[PDB]
């Protein structure tokens, strides 16, 4: 019930998960800020596809895990993803922040 049991249980679940990585960004970001995030997003996409054996979704509505380019709170009300997150409040998919996803993969044995 502890250490790699958790890693092993996740590895199994991820083989049966659809993961979508978001296109939209949180408010007030510079071109560099966005680039740096995009590069990181790109490797997270690889770990999920290649290592965690998850299916990469091009539709965030058709996925069990949604990977954000920041915290959902920082996303504007008007963005497609925030709109979707808000409708899912009436019962769903797991909305992970950019930092949380980084933490997860690192615990899975895939550091950046």
């Amino acid at each position: 019930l502890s250490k790699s049991s958790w890693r092993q249980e996740w590895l199994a679940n991820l083989k049966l998960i659809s993961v979508s990585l978001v296109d939209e960004f949180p408010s007030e970001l510079s071109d560099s800020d966005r680039q740096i995030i995009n590069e990181k997003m790109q490797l997270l996409k690889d770990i999920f596809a290649n290592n965690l054996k998850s299916a990469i979704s091009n539709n965030f509505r058709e996925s069990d895990i949604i990977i954000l380019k920041g915290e959902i709170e920082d996303y504007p009300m008007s963005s497609e993803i925030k709109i979707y997150y808000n409708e899912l409040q009436n019962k769903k998919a797991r909305f992970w922040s950019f930092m949380k996803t980084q933490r997860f993969v690192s615990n899975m044995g895939f550091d950046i």
Binding site: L1, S2, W6, K100, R103, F104, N107
Partner: peptide, 10 residues
């Protein structure tokens, strides 16, 4: 139903 974080035991 599964935790996103590993079992922290320290």
């Amino acid at each position: 139903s599964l935790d996103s974080s590993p079992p922290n035991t320290s």
